[PDB]
Design a binder for this molecule. Structure first.
Ligand code: 27R
Ligand code: CA
Ligand code: CA
Ligand code: CA
Ligand code: CL
Ligand code: CL
Lengths: 362, 365
């Protein structure tokens, strides 16, 4: 195996495939020269990323694996414009550029783990911007290290012509749906949280669409010359349709920024261990109050649009701030039922994302 | 006590005086002292080793008096209010009420009388210097300070007045940094240890403007005045190592090289150095440097560079992190390494200036 290529052509591929490993070979990249192509592959056993680089300078086929981070840091640390010559020499891989030389340890390409082969059952394309919107809208509501493993990822659901994401940790839920102009079978799978992250990282923001393939136990995404594949998570994800409040009859509209800053300020004098605030809803007015063990008190009064019965209801500050930060809105609609029931929250101008938040007792 | 102030008149002062303060040992140490007197709001934060005081002119109606309130909470409130907001503040016994628009905050107080103050002390030396000079002096050496060493004095930074120069020295027992800058006045000879957190505060108060820095030093305190801020620290009582005895005696061998090429070569070689011991080898020959690294995985890096060097060949090992720290602190065009042999320290300087010197001990590889 032998190739020479510009540093410039390696940097993006290396960054993508490089994303303490539980087994040494999982800290290595698989390098393969075949035809006029260098392929680079990274994997953590649950997912993998493959990148391709065209070779025009003399090259020789073959394959090996080398330490990912070291190889990346070497390439990145060489000067702009550098040409990098690489050749496998028994147990080492020699990397040369200018009067810099590096000898890296190898592990056999034969050892490099592959995902058990699988079959695509559902396929579609969509714009990168759309996938980005869908993930960003809901990612923050995924569980972290919940024993209910299926909550640690994100539901991807096809229905009609829409792709939908759902995420929840049992206390708050996020759902976002976007049309993609293709008639789709109804289908639902759970992508693990590291997969969601990896998938976001491969989006750059061109009009070049993403190609998605979904199997019974895998998801694959192709964009540019990168191919990402992840295992899916087993289990029965919650049905957002049953989480949405049935009759959230009390509708309140507020400015998003004003609401956010009122929450943030009042939270300063909330309990540090469990930060929440009390909302008193009255005709065209919202009062937000916080109290702490030191008997300190914050109060914020806001003008809002609300006509309906008065009620007091408490919320975790972070849950509401997370939602407002995901909506990036001009005005927000809060749809309330009573003091002990979850609230539904949306951009006042769009129904494509919705958030459900359990109340907090204070 | 009453005052009303525009958010931005109050905000940077609040930020600044909260500097010496996470989890305060006792509640008062988490508070700022507020004093309204003679048209001025004074704010003070302390950690018992040092104090930062800010004076804020009051152009709106006010009433004198003093209290203490939680620093972080008060700052976060003020920062969190809208740009240009008017902040009205009044002491009401056990609480201090802050009002702005339809935002209200009640903060718990502790008596001004309980706020600790540094003892009176007398200044024995005084001078003014440009902020940029103090910045230069500190940045040149701060990285060589020890970290939680039992020789407590190595955790601070030596400041020395001598001739027309102010000097800083820092060392952790393995490498040393020393930097001297002219300021234009003759000074009596003083040598004081500024505590770690003091160095950080001196740096924080440099606003990057043309307000000069005024320094006063006593036997057990240092004070710095910039604009409307006054910083005071106790000095560390200890026996700091003398740098003059650390500088290699007769470094006969002088190498010059481009700083950035040298840095980037070391940086790449470091990748394949021992993760704990970080050893690299330098081979010095006529107008050439070769840098090699290897690790327990039997991986190897080699870098060859053109340098200016005449005279006897030699080989010497160094901790590459210590070397990179020096090159990063020098930030210049060309560097001079002054060498003796494989068992002796190296002295490193900007080739174009003797104002900063660095001493790094060798490693047996
Ligand atoms: N059905 C759920 C499961 C699956 C299961 O327990 O078998 C797990 C966690 C939550 C739910 C909810 O119904 C739920 C309710 C309100 C909000 Br806000 C978010 C989720
Ligand atoms: Ca991977
Ligand atoms: Ca929806
Ligand atoms: Ca000097
Ligand atoms: Cl030393
Ligand atoms: Cl070599």
């Amino acid at each position: 195996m032998k190739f020479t290529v510009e540093r410039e052509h390696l940097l993006k591929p290396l960054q993508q495939v490089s994303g303490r490993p539980t087994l040494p070979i999982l800290g290595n990249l698989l390098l393969q020269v075949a035809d006029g192509t260098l392929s680079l592959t990274g994997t953590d056993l649950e997912m993998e990323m493959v990148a391709r680089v065209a070779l025009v300078q003399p090259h020789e086929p073959g394959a090996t694996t080398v330490p990912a981070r070291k190889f990346f840091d070497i390439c990145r640390g060489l000067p702009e414009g550098a040409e990098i010559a690489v050749q496998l020499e028994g147990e080492r891989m020699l990397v040369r550029s200018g009067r810099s030389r590096f000898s890296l340890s190898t592990l056999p390409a034969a050892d490099f783990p592959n995902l058990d082969d699988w079959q695509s059952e559902v396929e579609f394309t969509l714009p990168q911007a759309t996938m980005k919107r869908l993930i960003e809208a809901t990612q923050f509501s995924m569980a972290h290290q919940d024993v209910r493993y299926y909550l640690n990822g994100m539901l991807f659901e096809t229905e009609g012509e829409e792709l939908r994401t759902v995420a929840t940790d049992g206390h708050r839920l996020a759902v976002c749906s976007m049309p993609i102009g293709q008639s789709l079978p109804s289908h639902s799978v759970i992508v693990p949280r590291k997969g969601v992250i990896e998938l976001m990282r491969m989006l750059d923001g061109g009009d070049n669409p993403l190609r998605v393939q979904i199997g019974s136990n895998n998801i694959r995404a192709h964009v540019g010359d990168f191919i990402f594949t992840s295992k899916l998570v087993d289990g029965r994800f919650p049905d957002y349709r049953r989480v949405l409040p049935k009759n959230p009859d009390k509708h309140l509209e507020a400015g998003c920024d004003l609401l956010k800053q009122a929450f943030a300020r009042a939270a300063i004098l909330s309990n540090e261990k469990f930060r929440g605030v009390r909302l008193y809803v009255s005709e065209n007015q919202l009062k937000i109050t916080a109290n702490n063990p030191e008997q300190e008190e914050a109060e914020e009064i806001l003008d809002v649009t609300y006509s309906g019965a008065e009620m007091e209801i408490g919320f975790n500050v972070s849950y509401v701030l997370d939602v407002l930060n995901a909506l990036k809105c001009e005005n927000v609609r809060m749809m309330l039922t009573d003091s002990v029931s979850s609230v539904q929250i949306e951009d006042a101008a769009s129904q494509s994302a919705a958030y459900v938040v359990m109340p907090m007792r204070l």
